[PDB]
């Protein structure tokens, strides 16, 4: 079956798009065209960011689609069928949802991996780079699989660190150790 089975909430639509356009081989193209229309949707503020949510007709929904495909003369044709589907199912709220999901599948085709290095505060770039190197060096990142690593600020955790990527994490935090210390001195 096609790489990465997500099957989200209306992510079966994304899956469908992925596999259908994967056999067209125009997934990068599709993704790019989808991104371009998604961006111009995001930069369309009245409607589709203020009537992102529906209340429109079938016919009016269709006419909203016609304006959307009026803006782009490069819009593939599988995502023009996807637009049709979304119009017909009268979902537009799962427009960005599908975009994100198709993106995950797409970047799975690309083989880009994602990670996160939550910390209390944002840290040094030297640390970021050393960790990125380390993670790529480690078997955790496979070869032919790229690494995207995002440091995030998670002041919710005070002190400590957690490295996260490929749903496998190493958590060397202060909080857990403090917890354990406390617990053991409540023994």
């Amino acid at each position: 079956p096609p790489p990465v089975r997500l099957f989200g909430v209306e992510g079966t639509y994304a899956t469908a798009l992925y596999q259908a356009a994967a056999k067209n081989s125009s997934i990068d193209a599709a993704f790019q065209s989808l991104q371009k229309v998604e961006s111009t949707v995001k930069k369309n503020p009245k409607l589709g960011h203020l009537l992102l949510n529906p209340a429109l007709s079938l016919k009016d929904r269709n006419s909203v689609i016609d304006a959307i495909v009026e803006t782009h003369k490069n819009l593939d044709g599988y995502v023009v069928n996807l637009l049709k589907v979304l119009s017909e199912n009268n979902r537009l709220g799962c427009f960005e949802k599908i975009a994100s999901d198709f993106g995950v599948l797409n970047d799975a085709h690309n083989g880009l991996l994602k990670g996160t290095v939550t910390s209390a505060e944002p840290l040094d770039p030297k640390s970021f780079k050393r960790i990125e190197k380390a993670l790529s060096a480690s078997k955790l990142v496979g070869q032919g699989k790229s690494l995207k690593l995002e440091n995030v600020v998670k002041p919710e955790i005070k002190g400590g660190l957690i490295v996260e990527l490929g749903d496998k994490t190493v958590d060397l935090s202060i909080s857990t150790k403090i917890q354990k210390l406390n617990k053991v001195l409540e023994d």
Partner: protein
């Protein structure tokens, strides 16, 4: 957001590819949810409601749910045969059965396959599963008797051609046997002639085991009556949709007789099993269920079924389908939804009580709750005359008998009632497989009602009855001939009968 029937990834992926249903799916469709003997197919965009769909596995399934998604075809098949992703091809016919006269002497399953293997049925037509009941104007008032040859039934709740009377009472307390007796007494006219006095008999057995059915056919063949009987069967094993479909197609078979202007009688054993079947069906078509889990429109189904039997107008001959519904009462609880519903629909109740069977009253009829609303409109005139105060005696007996056990003082007047009452009850009792002619029920009832049995001791009442009949057969066989021929007791007959009773009550 929400689940949608087009979520299915194969449908969905075709839509992305700009591929469409292409209208082949106006008459074909691809299975995609199946299991539990219920399928839902995508396609069939033209499809009559209630149509029969020939599954490409080869099964037939009626279609009862039509959704803009997936039309829900209730399979008549078996799961193991069926496979998912199959194509289904529309029969193009709303459910229909072969109907004729050749069904006489045939056990047939729901789809009309002779399961007794008497080979091809000579069916003079096909009919449709639901056929609307004839109009108010298309009825004629009922007046023609139907008799089971059981004195209690005939006397207390007389049945007429084109009536619905509900046999209700505790499960498998030989419930069936009460009905079978009717078939047996219908031997006398059937063997004879007079078409309007012949009731062809259609016994419908739903939910019953093959062994039960086999016993029934054995008894019917033993009493040689299978010839005028039709047995429509849907055994317990056979599909719940087929069980649901079975009464309505039994009705159609009956309607051919009725329509032809001939009179017939349909026994529906057991409608309770129809309800269970419709329950299964409904809950796997996932409509929200009615109280007691039986579907919310169970009444509509049952009501339409029962109202399709009656006596037609003189315009339409006056062929009468007569019905006897039979409802099993679980723990004798009539407050139960299915019993409540049926009670309203039917034109009589023939309440049976289990305790009275053990008490020795067999047939055990709970005569207080047994009613025939139409009543003695169709009752034989002679039998009407004699049994006029039979109700009063029994009703008085019921009250008096209750008091007597609560240790209240008893006078001669109460003991007159007690003596009379005891004899009447004993008079009513009859052994299974013994229907008795009206000509020989009228004397016995005369004797009882005219109080001569009060004298005769309770133990030997059965002896008296047997001997009395023999005596009348020997001597007052002229009297019997007259009762048969004129069906009314003239003054001469009443006097003759009184004298006859006295002579045999004098031993």
């Amino acid at each position: 957001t929400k689940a949608q029937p087009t979520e299915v990834s194969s449908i969905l992926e075709e839509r992305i590819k700009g591929v469409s249903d292409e209208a082949n799916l106006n008459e074909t469709g691809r299975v995609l949810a199946v299991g539990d003997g219920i399928a839902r197919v995508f396609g069939l965009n033209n499809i009559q409601a209630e149509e029969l769909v020939e599954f490409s596995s080869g099964v037939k399934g009626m279609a009862l749910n039509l959704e803009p998604g997936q039309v829900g075809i209730v399979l008549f098949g078996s799961d193991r045969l069926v496979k998912e992703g199959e194509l289904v091809k529309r029969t193009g016919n709303i459910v229909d059965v072969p109907v004729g006269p050749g069904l006489l002497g045939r056990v047939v399953d729901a789809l009309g396959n002779p399961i007794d293997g008497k080979g091809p049925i000579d069916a003079a037509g096909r009919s449709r599963a639901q056929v609307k009941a004839p109009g108010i104007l298309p009825r004629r008032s009922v007046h023609e008797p139907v008799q089971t040859g059981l004195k209690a039934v005939d006397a207390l709740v007389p049945i007429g051609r084109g009536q619905r009377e509900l046999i209700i009472g505790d499960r498998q307390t030989g419930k069936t046997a009460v009905a079978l007796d009717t078939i047996l007494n219908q031997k006398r006219w059937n063997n004879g002639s007079d078409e309007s006095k012949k009731l062809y008999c259609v016994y419908v057995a739903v939910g019953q085991k093959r062994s039960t059915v086999a016993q029934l056919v054995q008894t019917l063949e033993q009493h040689d009556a299978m010839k005028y009987s039709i047995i429509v069967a849907a055994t317990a094993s056979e599909a719940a949709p087929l069980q649901y479909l079975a009464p309505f197609t039994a009705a159609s078979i009956g309607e051919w007789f009725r329509d032809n202007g001939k009179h017939a009688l349909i026994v529906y054993d057991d409608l309770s099993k129809q309800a269970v079947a419709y329950r299964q069906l409904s809950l796997l078509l996932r409509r929200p269920p009615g109280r007691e889990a039986y579907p919310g429109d169970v009444f509509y189904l049952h009501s339409r079924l029962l109202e399709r039997a009656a006596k037609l107008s003189e315009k339409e001959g006056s062929g009468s389908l007569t019905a006897l519904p039979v409802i099993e009462t679980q723990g004798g609880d009539v407050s139960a939804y299915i019993p409540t519903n049926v009670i309203s629909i039917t034109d009589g109740q023939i309440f049976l009580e289990a305790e009275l069977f053990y008490k020795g009253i067999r047939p055990a009829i709970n005569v207080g709750l047994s009613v025939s609303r139409v009543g003695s409109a169709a009752q034989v005139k002679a039998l009407k005359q004699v049994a006029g105060s039979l109700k009063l005696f029994l009703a008085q007996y019921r009250e008096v008998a209750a008091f007597a056990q609560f240790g209240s003082d008893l006078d001669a007047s109460t003991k007159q009632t007690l003596v009379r009452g005891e004899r009447l009850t004993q008079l009513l009792k009859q052994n299974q497989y013994s229907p008795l002619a009206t000509e020989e029920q009228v004397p016995l009832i005369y004797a009882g009602v005219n109080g001569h049995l009060d004298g005769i001791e309770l133990s030997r009442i059965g002896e008296f009855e047997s001997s009395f009949l023999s005596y009348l057969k020997s001597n007052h066989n002229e009297l019997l001939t007259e009762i048969r021929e004129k069906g009314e007791l003239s003054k001469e007959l009443l006097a003759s009968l009184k004298s006859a009773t006295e002579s045999f009550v004098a031993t």
